[PDB]
Amino acid sequence: LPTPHEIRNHLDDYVIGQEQAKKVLAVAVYNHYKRLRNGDTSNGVELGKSNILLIGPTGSGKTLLAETLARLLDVPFTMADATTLTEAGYVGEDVENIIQKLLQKSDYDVQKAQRGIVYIDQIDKISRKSDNPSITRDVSGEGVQQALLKLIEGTVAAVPPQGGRKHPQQEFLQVDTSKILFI
Amino acid sequence: LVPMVIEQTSRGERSFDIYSRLLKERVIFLTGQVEDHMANLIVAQMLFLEAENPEKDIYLYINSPGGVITAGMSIYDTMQFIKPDVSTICMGQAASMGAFLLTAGAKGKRFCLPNSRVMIHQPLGGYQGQATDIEIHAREILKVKGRMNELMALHTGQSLEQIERDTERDRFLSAPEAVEYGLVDSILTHRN
Numbered sequence: 001l002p003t004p005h006e007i008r009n010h011l012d013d014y015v016i017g018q019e020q021a022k023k024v025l026a027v028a029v030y031n032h033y034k035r036l037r038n039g040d041t042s043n044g045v046e047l048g049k050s051n052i053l054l055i056g057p058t059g060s061g062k063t064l065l066a067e068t069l070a071r072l073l074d075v076p077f078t079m080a081d082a083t084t085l086t087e088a089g090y091v092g093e094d095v096e097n098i099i100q101k102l103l104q105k106s107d108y109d110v111q112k113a114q115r116g117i118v119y120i121d122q123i124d125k126i127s128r129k130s131d132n133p134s135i136t137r138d139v140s141g142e143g144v145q146q147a148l149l150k151l152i153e154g155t156v157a158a159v160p161p162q163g164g165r166k167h168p169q170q171e172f173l174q175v176d177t178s179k180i181l182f183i
Numbered sequence: 184l185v186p187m188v189i190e191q192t193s194r195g196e197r198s199f200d201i202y203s204r205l206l207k208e209r210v211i212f213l214t215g216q217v218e219d220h221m222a223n224l225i226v227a228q229m230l231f232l233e234a235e236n237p238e239k240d241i242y243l244y245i246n247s248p249g250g251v252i253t254a255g256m257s258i259y260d261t262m263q264f265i266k267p268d269v270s271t272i273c274m275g276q277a278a279s280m281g282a283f284l285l286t287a288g289a290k291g292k293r294f295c296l297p298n299s300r301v302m303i304h305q306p307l308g309g310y311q312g313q314a315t316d317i318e319i320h321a322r323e324i325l326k327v328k329g330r331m332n333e334l335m336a337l338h339t340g341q342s343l344e345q346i347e348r349d350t351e352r353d354r355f356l357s358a359p360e361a362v363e364y365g366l367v368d369s370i371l372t373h374r375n
Protein backbone atom coordinates (compact mmCIF):
# COMPACT_ATOMS: atom_id res chain seq x y z
CA LEU A 1 0.00 0.00 0.00
CA PRO A 2 2.47 2.65 -1.17
CA THR A 3 1.66 6.35 -0.84
CA PRO A 4 2.89 9.44 -2.75
CA HIS A 5 4.66 10.73 0.36
CA GLU A 6 6.44 7.43 0.97
CA ILE A 7 7.38 6.93 -2.69
CA ARG A 8 8.50 10.55 -3.01
CA ASN A 9 10.64 10.26 0.11
CA HIS A 10 12.41 7.32 -1.51
CA LEU A 11 12.86 9.15 -4.81
CA ASP A 12 14.02 12.31 -3.02
CA ASP A 13 16.99 10.34 -1.70
CA TYR A 14 18.31 9.88 -5.26
CA VAL A 15 17.05 13.07 -6.97
CA ILE A 16 17.20 16.73 -5.91
CA GLY A 17 15.51 19.87 -7.24
CA GLN A 18 12.74 18.10 -9.19
CA GLU A 19 9.74 18.65 -6.92
CA GLN A 20 7.34 19.16 -9.84
CA ALA A 21 8.54 16.07 -11.72
CA LYS A 22 8.36 13.83 -8.65
CA LYS A 23 4.71 14.67 -7.96
CA VAL A 24 3.61 13.55 -11.43
CA LEU A 25 5.28 10.15 -11.10
CA ALA A 26 3.89 9.56 -7.62
CA VAL A 27 0.32 10.15 -8.80
CA ALA A 28 0.68 7.91 -11.85
CA VAL A 29 2.41 5.18 -9.85
CA TYR A 30 -0.21 5.43 -7.11
CA ASN A 31 -3.08 5.60 -9.60
CA HIS A 32 -1.66 2.80 -11.75
CA TYR A 33 -1.45 0.44 -8.78
CA LYS A 34 -4.93 1.59 -7.79
CA ARG A 35 -6.29 1.10 -11.32
CA LEU A 36 -5.00 -2.46 -11.57
CA ARG A 37 -6.15 -3.24 -8.03
CA ASN A 38 -9.73 -2.44 -9.02
CA GLY A 39 -11.66 -5.42 -10.33
CA ASP A 40 -13.08 -3.06 -13.02
CA THR A 41 -16.56 -4.61 -12.42
CA SER A 42 -17.98 -1.35 -11.08
CA ASN A 43 -19.76 1.78 -12.27
CA GLY A 44 -16.47 3.12 -13.60
CA VAL A 45 -15.79 1.26 -16.86
CA GLU A 46 -12.62 1.46 -18.97
CA LEU A 47 -10.84 3.77 -16.55
CA GLY A 48 -8.57 6.27 -18.24
CA LYS A 49 -4.79 6.00 -18.23
CA SER A 50 -2.66 9.13 -17.91
CA ASN A 51 0.63 8.91 -19.78
CA ILE A 52 3.72 10.98 -18.96
CA LEU A 53 6.05 13.10 -21.10
CA LEU A 54 9.33 14.05 -19.38
CA ILE A 55 10.93 17.02 -21.15
CA GLY A 56 13.98 18.67 -19.64
CA PRO A 57 17.44 20.10 -20.32
CA THR A 58 20.43 17.90 -21.01
CA GLY A 59 21.85 15.96 -18.07
CA SER A 60 19.13 17.21 -15.72
CA GLY A 61 18.38 13.69 -14.43
CA LYS A 62 15.50 12.42 -16.59
CA THR A 63 17.04 9.04 -17.36
CA LEU A 64 17.98 8.65 -13.69
CA LEU A 65 14.38 8.92 -12.47
CA ALA A 66 13.28 5.93 -14.54
CA GLU A 67 16.21 3.84 -13.29
CA THR A 68 15.59 4.55 -9.60
CA LEU A 69 11.88 3.84 -10.01
CA ALA A 70 12.44 0.24 -11.14
CA ARG A 71 14.32 -0.59 -7.93
CA LEU A 72 11.37 0.47 -5.78
CA LEU A 73 8.77 -0.71 -8.29
CA ASP A 74 7.44 -4.24 -7.81
CA VAL A 75 5.80 -4.65 -11.23
CA PRO A 76 8.09 -5.18 -14.25
CA PHE A 77 9.91 -2.25 -15.82
CA THR A 78 11.77 -1.95 -19.12
CA MET A 79 13.92 0.84 -20.57
CA ALA A 80 14.10 0.92 -24.37
CA ASP A 81 15.21 3.59 -26.85
CA ALA A 82 13.69 5.01 -30.03
CA THR A 83 17.05 5.28 -31.81
CA THR A 84 16.94 1.77 -33.28
CA LEU A 85 13.23 1.81 -34.17
CA THR A 86 12.34 1.72 -37.87
CA GLU A 87 8.88 1.71 -39.40
CA ALA A 88 7.51 -0.57 -42.13
CA GLY A 89 9.54 -3.58 -41.06
CA TYR A 90 12.93 -2.22 -42.06
CA VAL A 91 16.30 -3.70 -41.09
CA GLY A 92 16.82 -1.50 -38.03
CA GLU A 93 14.16 -2.61 -35.55
CA ASP A 94 10.41 -2.88 -35.06
CA VAL A 95 8.18 -1.44 -32.35
CA GLU A 96 7.38 -4.92 -31.03
CA ASN A 97 10.98 -5.09 -29.76
CA ILE A 98 9.87 -3.00 -26.77
CA ILE A 99 7.35 -5.61 -25.63
CA GLN A 100 9.66 -8.62 -25.85
CA LYS A 101 12.27 -6.73 -23.82
CA LEU A 102 9.70 -6.37 -21.04
CA LEU A 103 9.20 -10.13 -20.81
CA GLN A 104 12.94 -10.63 -20.28
CA LYS A 105 12.57 -8.66 -17.05
CA SER A 106 9.23 -10.35 -16.32
CA ASP A 107 10.43 -13.88 -17.18
CA TYR A 108 7.80 -14.25 -19.92
CA ASP A 109 4.73 -13.71 -17.73
CA VAL A 110 1.89 -12.26 -19.81
CA GLN A 111 -0.48 -11.51 -16.94
CA LYS A 112 2.33 -9.82 -15.00
CA ALA A 113 3.72 -7.97 -18.04
CA GLN A 114 0.55 -6.11 -19.03
CA ARG A 115 0.64 -4.37 -15.63
CA GLY A 116 4.24 -3.25 -16.30
CA ILE A 117 5.65 0.22 -16.93
CA VAL A 118 7.61 1.31 -20.00
CA TYR A 119 10.21 4.05 -20.47
CA ILE A 120 11.63 5.53 -23.69
CA ASP A 121 14.67 7.80 -24.04
CA GLN A 122 15.68 10.31 -26.71
CA ILE A 123 12.11 10.76 -27.96
CA ASP A 124 13.08 14.01 -29.68
CA LYS A 125 15.18 12.02 -32.18
CA ILE A 126 11.98 11.23 -34.14
CA SER A 127 10.61 14.77 -34.37
CA ARG A 128 10.24 16.23 -37.84
CA LYS A 129 12.94 18.78 -38.67
CA SER A 130 10.63 21.79 -38.15
CA ASP A 131 9.01 21.21 -41.55
CA ASN A 132 5.57 20.71 -43.05
CA PRO A 133 4.43 17.21 -44.12
CA SER A 134 7.30 15.59 -45.99
CA ILE A 135 7.51 14.95 -49.73
CA THR A 136 8.99 11.46 -49.19
CA ARG A 137 8.97 8.66 -46.64
CA ASP A 138 10.82 9.40 -43.38
CA VAL A 139 11.48 5.92 -41.97
CA SER A 140 12.95 7.45 -38.78
CA GLY A 141 10.84 10.38 -37.64
CA GLU A 142 7.28 11.06 -38.76
CA GLY A 143 6.96 7.38 -39.67
CA VAL A 144 7.90 6.10 -36.22
CA GLN A 145 5.36 8.32 -34.46
CA GLN A 146 2.55 6.95 -36.64
CA ALA A 147 3.32 3.40 -35.45
CA LEU A 148 3.37 4.22 -31.74
CA LEU A 149 -0.09 5.85 -31.78
CA LYS A 150 -2.07 2.61 -31.67
CA LEU A 151 0.38 1.08 -29.20
CA ILE A 152 -0.15 3.83 -26.62
CA GLU A 153 -3.95 3.75 -26.82
CA GLY A 154 -4.12 -0.03 -26.40
CA THR A 155 -3.85 -3.02 -28.73
CA VAL A 156 -2.38 -6.51 -29.07
CA ALA A 157 1.00 -7.01 -30.75
CA ALA A 158 2.54 -10.29 -31.88
CA VAL A 159 5.58 -11.21 -29.77
CA PRO A 160 7.50 -14.53 -30.04
CA PRO A 161 7.97 -15.81 -26.46
CA GLN A 162 11.72 -16.27 -25.86
CA GLY A 163 12.15 -15.57 -29.58
CA GLY A 164 10.57 -18.98 -30.30
CA ARG A 165 12.13 -22.33 -29.43
CA LYS A 166 12.17 -23.70 -32.98
CA HIS A 167 10.03 -23.97 -36.11
CA PRO A 168 7.63 -26.23 -34.14
CA GLN A 169 5.68 -23.46 -32.40
CA GLN A 170 5.63 -20.81 -35.19
CA GLU A 171 3.22 -18.73 -33.08
CA PHE A 172 3.09 -15.34 -31.38
CA LEU A 173 1.63 -14.33 -28.02
CA GLN A 174 -0.91 -11.52 -27.97
CA VAL A 175 0.09 -8.79 -25.50
CA ASP A 176 -2.59 -6.28 -24.52
CA THR A 177 -1.45 -2.69 -24.00
CA SER A 178 -4.59 -0.82 -22.91
CA LYS A 179 -3.43 -0.95 -19.28
CA ILE A 180 0.28 -0.38 -19.93
CA LEU A 181 1.66 3.01 -18.93
CA PHE A 182 4.22 4.81 -21.10
CA ILE A 183 6.85 7.37 -20.09
CA LEU B 184 16.17 48.40 -55.38
CA VAL B 185 13.56 45.63 -55.47
CA PRO B 186 12.07 44.17 -52.25
CA MET B 187 11.86 40.42 -51.70
CA VAL B 188 8.75 38.62 -50.43
CA ILE B 189 8.00 35.06 -49.31
CA GLU B 190 5.27 32.94 -50.91
CA GLN B 191 4.09 30.00 -48.81
CA THR B 192 3.68 26.70 -50.65
CA SER B 193 3.06 23.11 -49.60
CA ARG B 194 6.63 22.04 -50.41
CA GLY B 195 8.14 24.93 -48.48
CA GLU B 196 8.81 28.64 -48.40
CA ARG B 197 10.24 30.26 -51.53
CA SER B 198 11.80 33.69 -51.92
CA PHE B 199 10.57 35.74 -54.88
CA ASP B 200 11.01 39.28 -56.09
CA ILE B 201 7.93 41.49 -56.20
CA TYR B 202 7.83 41.44 -60.01
CA SER B 203 8.27 37.67 -60.29
CA ARG B 204 5.54 37.02 -57.73
CA LEU B 205 3.00 38.88 -59.83
CA LEU B 206 4.26 37.14 -62.96
CA LYS B 207 3.20 33.83 -61.40
CA GLU B 208 -0.37 35.21 -61.31
CA ARG B 209 -0.35 36.24 -64.99
CA VAL B 210 0.43 39.91 -64.31
CA ILE B 211 2.97 41.93 -66.31
CA PHE B 212 4.25 45.46 -65.72
CA LEU B 213 5.06 47.79 -68.64
CA THR B 214 7.12 50.69 -67.26
CA GLY B 215 9.11 53.43 -68.96
CA GLN B 216 9.82 53.97 -72.61
CA VAL B 217 9.12 51.14 -75.03
CA GLU B 218 12.40 50.00 -76.57
CA ASP B 219 13.86 46.86 -78.11
CA HIS B 220 15.06 45.45 -74.78
CA MET B 221 11.91 46.11 -72.76
CA ALA B 222 9.67 44.90 -75.58
CA ASN B 223 11.55 41.66 -76.21
CA LEU B 224 11.31 40.84 -72.50
CA ILE B 225 7.52 41.16 -72.32
CA VAL B 226 7.10 38.85 -75.31
CA ALA B 227 8.94 36.05 -73.53
CA GLN B 228 6.71 36.51 -70.49
CA MET B 229 3.53 36.34 -72.57
CA LEU B 230 4.75 33.21 -74.35
CA PHE B 231 5.71 31.65 -71.02
CA LEU B 232 2.19 32.17 -69.68
CA GLU B 233 0.63 30.72 -72.83
CA ALA B 234 2.28 27.35 -72.24
CA GLU B 235 1.50 27.34 -68.52
CA ASN B 236 -2.20 28.11 -68.99
CA PRO B 237 -3.91 29.26 -72.24
CA GLU B 238 -7.35 29.70 -70.60
CA LYS B 239 -6.57 32.15 -67.77
CA ASP B 240 -6.90 35.90 -68.20
CA ILE B 241 -3.75 38.04 -68.31
CA TYR B 242 -3.53 41.49 -66.71
CA LEU B 243 -1.25 44.11 -68.26
CA TYR B 244 -0.66 47.37 -66.38
CA ILE B 245 0.74 50.16 -68.57
CA ASN B 246 2.42 53.31 -67.21
CA SER B 247 4.68 54.70 -69.93
CA PRO B 248 5.19 57.86 -72.01
CA GLY B 249 5.43 55.78 -75.20
CA GLY B 250 8.39 55.18 -77.43
CA VAL B 251 9.46 53.35 -80.58
CA ILE B 252 6.65 52.11 -82.81
CA THR B 253 8.35 48.99 -84.20
CA ALA B 254 9.08 47.75 -80.68
CA GLY B 255 5.43 48.18 -79.72
CA MET B 256 3.94 46.58 -82.82
CA SER B 257 5.65 43.29 -81.97
CA ILE B 258 3.64 43.18 -78.75
CA TYR B 259 0.36 44.04 -80.47
CA ASP B 260 0.60 41.06 -82.81
CA THR B 261 1.49 38.85 -79.85
CA MET B 262 -1.59 39.88 -77.86
CA GLN B 263 -3.86 39.11 -80.80
CA PHE B 264 -2.08 35.91 -81.84
CA ILE B 265 -2.25 34.10 -78.49
CA LYS B 266 -5.57 32.69 -77.26
CA PRO B 267 -5.78 34.17 -73.71
CA ASP B 268 -7.64 37.43 -73.25
CA VAL B 269 -5.10 40.13 -72.38
CA SER B 270 -6.75 42.53 -69.94
CA THR B 271 -5.24 46.02 -70.03
CA ILE B 272 -5.20 48.76 -67.39
CA CYS B 273 -3.89 52.32 -67.74
CA MET B 274 -2.03 53.70 -64.72
CA GLY B 275 -0.69 57.25 -64.73
CA GLN B 276 -0.33 57.82 -68.46
CA ALA B 277 -0.69 56.13 -71.85
CA ALA B 278 0.99 57.85 -74.81
CA SER B 279 0.61 57.12 -78.55
CA MET B 280 2.02 53.61 -78.37
CA GLY B 281 0.80 53.03 -74.82
CA ALA B 282 -2.71 53.89 -75.99
CA PHE B 283 -2.43 51.50 -78.93
CA LEU B 284 -1.63 48.59 -76.63
CA LEU B 285 -4.46 49.67 -74.33
CA THR B 286 -7.18 49.54 -76.98
CA ALA B 287 -5.72 46.33 -78.44
CA GLY B 288 -6.77 44.44 -75.30
CA ALA B 289 -9.68 42.04 -75.17
CA LYS B 290 -13.06 43.65 -75.72
CA GLY B 291 -14.90 44.11 -72.44
CA LYS B 292 -11.74 43.71 -70.31
CA ARG B 293 -10.17 47.15 -70.81
CA PHE B 294 -10.13 49.59 -67.89
CA CYS B 295 -8.76 53.01 -67.03
CA LEU B 296 -8.37 54.56 -63.60
CA PRO B 297 -10.53 57.60 -62.73
CA ASN B 298 -7.55 60.01 -62.85
CA SER B 299 -5.54 58.40 -65.64
CA ARG B 300 -4.74 60.30 -68.83
CA VAL B 301 -4.30 59.19 -72.43
CA MET B 302 -2.44 61.04 -75.18
CA ILE B 303 -2.39 60.21 -78.89
CA HIS B 304 -0.53 61.81 -81.78
CA GLN B 305 0.97 60.90 -85.15
CA PRO B 306 4.24 59.01 -85.70
CA LEU B 307 7.47 60.98 -85.38
CA GLY B 308 10.53 60.53 -87.53
CA GLY B 309 13.21 62.14 -89.62
CA TYR B 310 15.99 61.49 -92.08
CA GLN B 311 19.07 63.22 -93.49
CA GLY B 312 20.48 62.48 -96.93
CA GLN B 313 19.66 62.71 -100.61
CA ALA B 314 16.16 63.66 -101.72
CA THR B 315 15.65 60.18 -103.19
CA ASP B 316 16.26 58.59 -99.79
CA ILE B 317 14.03 61.07 -97.96
CA GLU B 318 11.13 60.13 -100.24
CA ILE B 319 11.60 56.46 -99.34
CA HIS B 320 11.52 57.01 -95.58
CA ALA B 321 8.62 59.43 -96.04
CA ARG B 322 6.53 56.89 -97.94
CA GLU B 323 7.30 54.24 -95.32
CA ILE B 324 6.37 56.35 -92.30
CA LEU B 325 3.21 57.44 -94.12
CA LYS B 326 2.09 53.83 -94.48
CA VAL B 327 2.65 53.30 -90.76
CA LYS B 328 0.48 56.31 -89.93
CA GLY B 329 -2.25 54.92 -92.17
CA ARG B 330 -1.84 51.44 -90.72
CA MET B 331 -1.97 52.68 -87.13
CA ASN B 332 -5.21 54.54 -87.82
CA GLU B 333 -6.86 51.50 -89.42
CA LEU B 334 -6.19 49.31 -86.38
CA MET B 335 -7.17 52.07 -83.95
CA ALA B 336 -10.58 52.30 -85.62
CA LEU B 337 -10.98 48.51 -85.53
CA HIS B 338 -10.77 48.30 -81.73
CA THR B 339 -12.34 51.68 -80.93
CA GLY B 340 -15.13 51.20 -83.48
CA GLN B 341 -14.87 54.79 -84.71
CA SER B 342 -14.51 55.68 -88.38
CA LEU B 343 -11.14 56.13 -90.04
CA GLU B 344 -12.01 59.74 -90.88
CA GLN B 345 -12.57 60.57 -87.21
CA ILE B 346 -9.28 59.03 -86.08
CA GLU B 347 -7.37 60.95 -88.76
CA ARG B 348 -8.62 64.34 -87.59
CA ASP B 349 -8.15 63.65 -83.87
CA THR B 350 -4.61 62.24 -84.32
CA GLU B 351 -3.26 65.11 -86.44
CA ARG B 352 -1.93 66.76 -83.27
CA ASP B 353 -1.61 65.88 -79.60
CA ARG B 354 -4.99 65.16 -78.01
CA PHE B 355 -5.42 64.44 -74.31
CA LEU B 356 -8.42 62.34 -73.26
CA SER B 357 -9.53 62.01 -69.66
CA ALA B 358 -10.67 58.69 -68.22
CA PRO B 359 -14.44 59.33 -68.61
CA GLU B 360 -14.06 60.55 -72.19
CA ALA B 361 -12.15 57.38 -73.10
CA VAL B 362 -15.24 55.28 -72.36
CA GLU B 363 -17.44 57.48 -74.55
CA TYR B 364 -14.79 57.19 -77.27
CA GLY B 365 -14.94 53.38 -77.26
CA LEU B 366 -11.26 53.06 -76.33
CA VAL B 367 -12.06 51.36 -73.00
CA ASP B 368 -15.03 49.59 -71.44
CA SER B 369 -15.29 50.84 -67.85
CA ILE B 370 -13.50 52.36 -64.85
CA LEU B 371 -12.35 50.46 -61.76
CA THR B 372 -13.23 53.06 -59.13
CA HIS B 373 -13.64 50.75 -56.12
CA ARG B 374 -13.31 47.06 -55.36
CA ASN B 375 -16.54 45.04 -55.41
Ligand SMILES: Nc1ncnc2c1ncn2[C@@H]1O[C@H](COP(=O)(O)OP(=O)(O)OP(O)(O)=S)[C@@H](O)[C@H]1O
Nearest residue numbers: 014015016017056057058059060061062063064065
Ligand atom coordinates in the same frame (compact mmCIF):
# COMPACT_ATOMS: atom_id res chain seq x y z
N1 LIG C 1 19.32 15.46 -9.29
C1 LIG C 1 20.35 14.63 -9.44
N2 LIG C 1 20.91 14.08 -8.34
C2 LIG C 1 21.95 13.25 -8.49
N3 LIG C 1 22.55 12.85 -9.61
C3 LIG C 1 21.97 13.41 -10.69
C4 LIG C 1 20.90 14.28 -10.69
N4 LIG C 1 20.57 14.65 -11.99
C5 LIG C 1 21.44 14.00 -12.72
N5 LIG C 1 22.32 13.22 -12.00
C6 LIG C 1 23.39 12.39 -12.54
O1 LIG C 1 23.25 12.34 -13.94
C7 LIG C 1 23.35 10.97 -14.39
C8 LIG C 1 22.53 10.79 -15.65
O2 LIG C 1 21.31 11.52 -15.51
P1 LIG C 1 20.27 11.52 -16.69
O3 LIG C 1 18.89 11.04 -16.22
O4 LIG C 1 20.86 10.75 -17.81
O5 LIG C 1 20.10 13.04 -17.09
P2 LIG C 1 19.43 13.33 -18.48
O6 LIG C 1 19.03 14.75 -18.60
O7 LIG C 1 18.26 12.34 -18.58
O8 LIG C 1 20.41 12.92 -19.65
P3 LIG C 1 19.83 12.28 -20.94
O9 LIG C 1 18.34 11.90 -20.69
O10 LIG C 1 20.63 10.99 -21.28
S1 LIG C 1 19.95 13.54 -22.42
C9 LIG C 1 22.87 10.15 -13.20
O11 LIG C 1 23.41 8.83 -13.25
C10 LIG C 1 23.42 10.95 -12.01
O12 LIG C 1 24.75 10.57 -11.69
